[PDB]
Design a binder for this molecule. Structure first.
Ligand code: HEM
Ligand SMILES: CC(C)(C)OC(=O)N[C@H](CS[C@H](Cc1ccccc1)C(=O)NCCc1cccnc1)Cc1ccccc1
Ligand SMILES: NC(=O)CC[C@H](N)C(=O)O
Length: 450
């Protein structure tokens, strides 16, 4: 029973139950459990997901040591989850030097400059987003934002990943919309992670085996046709590391879809919940959007980077709702960091959500206050506490793309509409008690036309 480990190391934490460990304690969610451990235990604690020891760490130096200083040597991979099948080749899932290769091959895809070329295609769908919003706006009926934002998120994806171009909300069941639609179990992994190789030998998959088979073929539909977008950029690359294979490109595409789809849509919904429940911040943003882009002029790459308040609204939103919730690295070797022994196989965990709401680093942390990210105040913000995109060599590769995409949505939408709360709006919003950082009730708000 692996449940003596922290107890030996002199590291504190909750007593595990046989077999389940501390998972019973997840009934309020990952987040509330992390906060309560933090406030009960201080700078470090340990717990067991089943038999898996997990060590939480909250010292910023120690966090930097783990995420950055000792990344390639010790804290290189994430907690293995499965069964993944061919998606083991996905970059977010791959390990050790197999990953170091993929990161290299896929990096220039995400540069400052390549993102600059991607904006005019993201624009044409900002319009779509607005005319989609208008036909819901002139019909005075509260709007579920995950739906209209989700549709925009997806529109960006298929063009930026494959050059495909659809009006998904309206324009129909396109041969591409319904596969990507397959966009309770994942807990019972952890009492039984010895069953992963069982499923992995039953060829089952957490990526529905028909979606992938479609993209696997739909991507190999797009390849031999050409012979602007991620596919392009990846394909152009395979012309020091071995070039990207053919099933590898598919799995990365899948990861880009998974990554971008329910992230862009959900943050955008959080931002509009906050903007609507704070009518004044919406006002200041709408002023900035008009002083920079007068006469509803179309946003650009450089004018997006110019909007400082827009950036403050985005950053603070992700402080309250960091959708990763936690960052995790597998300790791959017996190791000591900043005066603490961490033994092999331990999963080291950084409770991002809990650290973003710590009253010790943040005043009024449950309040939404975009002035903490002002040039005046922004300096006092430890980048190893605020880590909505991770840090170090393994942080979110799509960071600059995520931000640009979202801001482009916001600017366009805020140029035509203000957003009020509605009687069905959940005030105060509540996080889905499950494993995902989404709201319980979906965000429904009033939309008006300026
Ligand atoms: C609001 C949007 C997003 C947020 C807040 C976000 C945040 C994060 C975080 C916290 C991580 C883990 C970082 C770490 O472990 O240190 C991550 C990983 C990752 N993200 Fe994002 N992400 C977003 C969107 C995207 C998008 C649009 C892409 C598009 C390609 C993307 C691609 C990835 C990949 C590939 C990884 C894993 C990278 C690796 O393991 O090398 N993400 N993201
Ligand atoms: C089951 C659990 C929670 C233990 O394991 C994870 O589900 N976890 C990620 C592995 S599957 C995920 C894609 C996916 C596949 C099937 C169903 C849902 C999701 C993935 O790899 N997404 C990386 C792309 C991304 C997502 C979010 C933000 N940015 C980029 C690994 C991971 C965890 C946190 C942040 C980044 C990666
Ligand atoms: N380049 C590296 O990351 C590792 C260096 C070492 N020579 C090796 O081949 O593993």
């Amino acid at each position: 029973h692996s449940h003596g480990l922290f107890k030996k190391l002199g590291i504190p934490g909750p007593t595990p139950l046989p077999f389940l460990g501390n998972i019973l304690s997840y009934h309020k969610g990952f987040c509330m459990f992390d906060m309560e451990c933090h406030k009960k235990y201080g700078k470090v604690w340990g717990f067991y997901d089943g038999q898996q020891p997990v060590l939480a760490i909250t010292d910023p130096d120690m966090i930097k040591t783990v995420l950055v200083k000792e990344c390639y040597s010790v804290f290189t991979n994430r907690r293995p989850f499965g069964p993944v099948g061919f998606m083991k080749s996905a970059i977010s899932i791959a390990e050790d030097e197999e990953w170091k290769r993929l990161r290299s091959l896929l990096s220039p895809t995400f540069t400052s400059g390549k993102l600059k070329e991607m904006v005019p295609i993201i624009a044409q769908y900002g319009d779509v987003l607005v005319r989609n919003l208008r036909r819901e706006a002139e019909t005075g009926k509260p709007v579920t934002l995950k739906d209209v934002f989700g549709a925009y998120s997806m529109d960006v994806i298929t063009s930026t990943s494959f050059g495909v171009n659809i009006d998904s909300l309206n324009n129909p069941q396109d041969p591409f919309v319904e596969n990507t639609k397959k966009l309770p179990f994942f807990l019972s992994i952890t009492v039984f992670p010895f069953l992963i190789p069982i499923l992995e030998v039953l060829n089952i998959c957490v990526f529905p085996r028909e979606v992938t088979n479609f993209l696997r073929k739909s991507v190999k539909r797009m390849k031999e046709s050409r012979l602007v977008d991620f596919l392009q950029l990846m394909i152009d690359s395979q012309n020091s590391h071995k070039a990207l294979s053919d099933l590898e490109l598919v799995a990365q595409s899948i990861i880009f879809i998974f990554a971008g789809y329910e992230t862009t849509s959900s943050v955008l919904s959080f931002i509009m919940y906050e903007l609507a429940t704070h009518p004044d911040v919406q006002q200041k943003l709408q002023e900035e959007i008009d002083a920079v882009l007068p006469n509803k002029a179309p946003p650009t790459y450089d004018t997006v980077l110019q909007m400082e308040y827009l950036d403050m609204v985005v950053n603070e939103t992700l402080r309250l709702f960091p959708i990763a919730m936690r960052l995790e690295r597998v300790c791959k070797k017996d190791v000591e960091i900043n005066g603490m022994f961490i033994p092999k196989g331990v999963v080291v965990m950084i409770p991002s959500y809990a650290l973003h709401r710590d009253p010790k680093y943040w005043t009024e942390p449950e309040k939404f206050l975009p002035e903490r990210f002002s040039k005046k105040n922004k300096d006092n913000i430890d980048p190893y506490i605020y880590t909505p995109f991770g840090s170090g060599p393994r942080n979110c590769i799509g960071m600059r793309f995520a931000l640009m995409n979202m801001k482009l949505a916001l600017i366009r939408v805020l140029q035509n509409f203000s957003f009020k709360p509605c009687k069905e709006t959940q005030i105060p919003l509540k996080l889905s008690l499950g494993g995902l950082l989404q709201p319980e009730k979906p965000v429904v708000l009033k939309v008006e036309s300026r």
